[PDB]
Design a protein around this ligand. Structure first.
Ligand SMILES: O=C(O)c1cccc(O)c1
Length: 376
């Protein structure tokens, strides 16, 4: 019997595999759930291809080539990481099949003309928290709390566009200009020079845009050079690799996060958390508290879940896997109750998460453990 075949490439192994493996588990769970109900209008779904790019742009190119080469693939869940996404995006756009972008936050992944919510790439739908959107909450917070903000970012478009939007939001809220900026390459082991720069500039806070493994190195380096100021990090950095690498130093780190798993949860987040736990247990993604999934699930797991459910709903509504038909059906979706947000798409609107879907959180000590609570 004919099946509906989708393809995926993401960071399944290596230092940033929290995203690729988290999304993989999400998509597999969405696939099993649809299939348990008969598939899409009676046709079962298969993940025909599941490739590993390791958050590496060159590997993502090879993988997307391979996926697009398979004529029977009707839609794609794309890689984590602005680097990989930007390396493949022209090819994906030219191909035309529906392509979900679950994570990458650089706005030109979806809106190459740099106005969010206008003239999106026609086949691309995004479940990311875009940088221009995350910067609104983080910029207001930094402008109000601090006077001498230093900014450190990974040297990718995520990091680079991140700082631009963060500094612009700080300015718009009337905050002081950042007193120092600097960058590091993903995987850098020595960040002494950048932190020493922050120290010479007498920062009262450091904002960082990057991922967990790296933020932990940065946090440890601050401690090492006696730079004891709040670290304000991006959502994508506040994951298991940060907590594990930073240990006690997580205290006082804060960040803007998709708030879906914060208590109390809305029904779709609660329903998803129950199903996830039933299959995978209280694993790395769930975190260290059996009764409460960690907030970081939203950016490592449920973005992929929502991406898959929207793709499947589009196919269901279209009653076809023809790419233009699926795209038009996705653009017809209104107020779909996803885990991370309610989704409403249109010909112009190809992203879902807005500022109402995020809040600023801080690590605070709860007895003898350390967890995120929302800021005052
Ligand atoms: O835009 C990215 O490169 C990215 C990668 C992982 C998590 C995240 O929030 C963003």
């Amino acid at each position: 019997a004919d099946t509906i075949k989708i393809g995926m490439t993401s960071a399944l192994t290596g230092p940033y595999n929290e995203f690729g493996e988290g999304n993989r588990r999400a998509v597999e769970l969405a696939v099993e759930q649809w299939n348990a109900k008969g598939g899409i209008n009676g046709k079962k779904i298969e993940i025909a291809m599941l490739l590993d790019d390791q958050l590496n742009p060159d590997r993502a190119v090879q993988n997307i080539r391979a996926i697009l080469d398979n004529k029977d693939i009707v839609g794609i869940i794309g890689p984590a990481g602005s680097g990989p996404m930007l390396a493949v995006i022209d090819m994906v756009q030219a191909d035309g099949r529906p392509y979900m972008n679950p994570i990458a936050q650089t706005p030109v992944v979806t809106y190459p003309g740099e106005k969010t919510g206008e003239k999106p790439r026609p086949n691309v739908f995004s479940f990311a928290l875009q940088n221009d959107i995350e910067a609104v909450a983080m910029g207001e917070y930094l402008a109000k709390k601090f006077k001498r903000v230093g900014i450190i970012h990974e040297s990718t478009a995520y990091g680079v566009t991140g700082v631009d939007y963060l500094a612009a939001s700080i300015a718009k809220n009337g905050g002081a200009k950042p007193v120092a900026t600097d960058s590091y390459n993903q995987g850098a082991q020595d960040m002494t020079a950048q932190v020493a720069r922050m120290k010479r500039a007498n920062v009262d806070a450091i904002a960082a845009i990057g991922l967990g493994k790296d933020l932990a190195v940065l946090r440890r380096t601050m401690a090492r050079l006696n730079v004891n100021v709040p670290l304000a990090a991006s959502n994508g950095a506040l994951g298991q690799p940060y907590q594990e690498g930073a240990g006690e130093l997580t205290l006082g780190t804060l960040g803007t996060m998709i708030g879906a798993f914060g208590n109390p949860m809305r029904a779709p987040a609660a329903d998803f958390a129950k199903a996830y736990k039933a299959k995978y247990g209280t694993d790395r993604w769930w975190g260290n508290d059996p009764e409460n999934p960690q907030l970081f699930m939203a950016i490592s797991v449920s973005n992929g879940y929502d991406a898959a459910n929207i793709l499947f709903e589009g196919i269901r509504l279209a009653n076809s896997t023809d790419p233009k038909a699926v795209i038009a059906a996705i653009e017809s979706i209104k107020d779909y109750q996803g885990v991370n947000t309610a989704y409403t798409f249109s010909k112009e609107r190809h992203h879902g998460i807005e500022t109402d879907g995020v809040k600023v959180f801080e690590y605070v000590k709860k007895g003898d453990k350390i967890r995120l609570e929302p800021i005052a």
